Amino acid sequence: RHELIGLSVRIARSVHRDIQGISGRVVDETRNTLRIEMDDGREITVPKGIAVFHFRTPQGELVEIDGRALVARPEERI
Structure with a gap:
């Protein structure tokens, strides 16, 4: 599986319009x-309360994540 720290991620729609349709690492x-950082050394936060986005791996992989319908609470228990 390998974590996703550093991978690329693109947002299609988020709770806030300021971040809605945002794209980054x-x-x-x-x-x-959702926390977004790019190897360039640029970091930016993006709430997951209602934000759908897919990740991209340089190796040639396509991952998808839902911030609107897949909002899960791990350490906080379900």
């Missing part, structure tokens, strides 16, 4: 918050 993932 990954840094960290939270139960209700």
Whole structure:
């Protein structure tokens, strides 16, 4: 599986319009918050409360994640 720290991620629609349709790299993932960082050294946060986005791996992989319908709470228990 391998974590997703550094991978690329694109948003199709998010709770906030300021981030809606945003695109960038990954840094960290939270139960209700998506953290975006790019190897360039640029980091930016993006709430997961209602944000669908797919990740891209240089190796040639296509991953998808839902911030609207797949909002799960791990450490916080279900």
